[PDB]
Amino acid sequence: DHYNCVSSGGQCLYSACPIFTKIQGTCYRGKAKCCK
């Protein structure tokens, strides 16, 4: 289940978090991780 990412200001990326963010959970089925 898409974790509350974009809600506050996050995005899903197939690879590890880009900027100095931190991945909390997973976005889609599990191909992308939710970061914020």
From Swiss-Prot:
Q: What is its main location?
A: secreted
Q: What is this protein called?
A: Beta-defensin 1
State the organism of origin: Homo sapiens
Disulfide feature: C5-C34, C12-C27, C17-C35
Name where it's found: Secreted; Membrane
Any GO BP annotation: antimicrobial humoral immune response mediated by antimicrobial peptide
Is Chaperone there in the keyword field?
A: no
GO molecular function, a single term: identical protein binding
The UniProt subunit note reads as follows: Monomer. Homodimer.
Q: What is the lineage of its organism?
A: Eukaryota, Metazoa, Chordata, Craniata, Vertebrata
Family under the similarity heading: Belongs to the beta-defensin family.
Name the job this protein performs: Has bactericidal activity. May act as a ligand for C-C chemokine receptor CCR6. Positively regulates the sperm motility and bactericidal activity in a CCR6-dependent manner. Binds to CCR6 and triggers Ca2+ mobilization in the sperm which is important for its motility.
Keyword check for Signal, yes or no.
yes
Q: Alphabetically list the UniProt keywords.
A: Antibiotic, Antimicrobial, Defensin, Disulfide bond, Membrane, Secreted, Signal
Q: Which GO terms describe its cellular component?
A: extracellular exosome; extracellular region; extracellular space; Golgi lumen; membrane; microvesicle; sperm midpiece
First and last residue shown, out of the full length, are 33 to 68 of 68
Q: In which tissues is it expressed?
A: Blood plasma. Sperm. Highly expressed in the lower head and midpiece of sperm. Significantly reduced levels found in the sperms of asthenozoospermia and leukocytospermia patients (at protein level).
